[PDB]
Structures are given as structure tokens and as C-alpha cells.
Amino acid sequence: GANPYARGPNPTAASLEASAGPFTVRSFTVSRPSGYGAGTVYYPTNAGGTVGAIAIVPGYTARQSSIKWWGPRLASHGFVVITIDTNSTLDQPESRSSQQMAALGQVASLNGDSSSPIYGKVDTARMGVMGWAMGGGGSLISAANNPSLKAAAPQAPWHSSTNFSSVTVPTLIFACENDSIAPVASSALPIYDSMSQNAKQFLEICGGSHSCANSGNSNQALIGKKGVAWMKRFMDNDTRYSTFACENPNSTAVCDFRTANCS
Numbered sequence: 001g002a003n004p005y006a007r008g009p010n011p012t013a014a015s016l017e018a019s020a021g022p023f024t025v026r027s028f029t030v031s032r033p034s035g036y037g038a039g040t041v042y043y044p045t046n047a048g049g050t051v052g053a054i055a056i057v058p059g060y061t062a063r064q065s066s067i068k069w070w071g072p073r074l075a076s077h078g079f080v081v082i083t084i085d086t087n088s089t090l091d092q093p094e095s096r097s098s099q100q101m102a103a104l105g106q107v108a109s110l111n112g113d114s115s116s117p118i119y120g121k122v123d124t125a126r127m128g129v130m131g132w133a134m135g136g137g138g139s140l141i142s143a144a145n146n147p148s149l150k151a152a153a154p155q156a157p158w159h160s161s162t163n164f165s166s167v168t169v170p171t172l173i174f175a176c177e178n179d180s181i182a183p184v185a186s187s188a189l190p191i192y193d194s195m196s197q198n199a200k201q202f203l204e205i206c207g208g209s210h211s212c213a214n215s216g217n218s219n220q221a222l223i224g225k226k227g228v229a230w231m232k233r234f235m236d237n238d239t240r241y242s243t244f245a246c247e248n249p250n251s252t253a254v255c256d257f258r259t260a261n262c263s
């Protein structure tokens, strides 16, 4: 019958482009981080069923502020979102992946903690990974190592190897045209081209610096619609989002669009 994971009203371009989704969001600071530096958990208060969880990691030198906008944007659509600070702001992609996974593990633990605001709010079997730059590379390593993850959506990713041919997890790569830190042509695009087994998409923002998908970006309507639609489609199996997830958005803000194996 019905998809047991579907949450929220039927989507529209306007409802996905809006600053906020349909659910009320609250947040808390993790009192004792397990395996990472610090975290903030964003959650819907009124989703109507258990929701999946997404862990988001910053880039080199960076903190939760760089990635914070995703917490309310995704949680308002029916997700538990943990944004993390790493043990060191100078940790590399492998370590960022371990930390990201440790954060997912703690979100799973908090689902079982009767003192937590997310007690019984999480479907621990449905998880996703995001992150910026080295954190984007960490997210891809997470996906490679943990193929039960349901979706990945890194931004301006970098890793010392571009070979992510082992990834079977649906992966959306946000890229920034004018990235001077992790140039598209040597980083995000080779990573995208490596992936052969999965649903995948590539979305490059015209004129974007390395921070083009960070908090305070000027394309939150398009980037947020894409990120939410990809997570809805693949973490929730929610085919109401198939077109939003798979379409070329036909946008003057998009300077490179690719997709494969999307339905």
C-alpha cells in the first residue's frame, strides 16, 4: 500500500523553494558529543511519524556556522539533522567521515534516550550524509564505507582521491563554478564522473565561490529545493519528489547540470 515513510504535504516548487518547510523546528546542543567535537540537533516537533537522520560536516577550518542553514531547512521538511564541529578544525576527510558517522550513531542513541527531545523521533535505519569541502569528501567516504546509507549530498567536495566508484548510495554533488579552493574540474566533476553504480546528480552554481552552498548563500531557494528533494526521494523512498530530485531545474543560476540513474 502507502509508503510508510512519506511525511508532509504534496510538494510544489513554491513549497520546496520556501525558506521553511511545513514542520515546526526546535534544536538542542549535544551535551556530551560521542566521537566528534560538538553538535547541534535540529528536529521537527510535529512530523507525524519517525523521520530519517542526516549528519552534516564543515570544511577545513570551518565550524557549524558554515553549514547551519541546512539544519532548519531540512528538519522543517521532516528530518533530524545534526550539524557538527570536528575534534580539530584541521581534521582531514577520513577523520571527518568517522566523526560524521559517530554523530549519526549518537543520534541513533538519543532516539533511545527517554530524556532526549528526539526520543522516538528517528528511524535509525534511514540516514544521510552531507558536508562542505573536506567534509564533502568525508561524506563520500562515509557513503563508500556504509552502503546502507540512503542518500549523500555533499557540497564543493574535495578528497585526495577522486575515485568514488565504490559508492552505491544516491549522491547529489553541489559544485561552485569559480571554486578556487577545490576547483570543479579537478575535484567535484572527477568525483561525479567516478560514480557508476548509483543514482547521481551534479549541480554547479554559476559564478559560485567555494562557499556557494554555505549559510548565507544567495541561492537558498534552488539549493534547498534540490537538497530536500534528493533527501526526500532517497531517504524516504518518496516518489512524490522524483521529478524535483531528477529534473534539470532549468535555472539561469546553474552552469553545469548532470544526472544518471535517477527515477
Ligand SMILES: O=C(O)c1ccc(C(=O)OCCO)cc1
Pocket (backbone or CB within 6 Å): 058, 059, 060, 132, 133, 134, 135, 158, 180, 181, 182, 183
Ligand atoms: O575543506 C577545505 O576547505 C579544503 C579542501 C581542499 C583543499 C585543497 O588544498 O585542495 C587542493 C586542491 O585545490 C584545502 C581545503
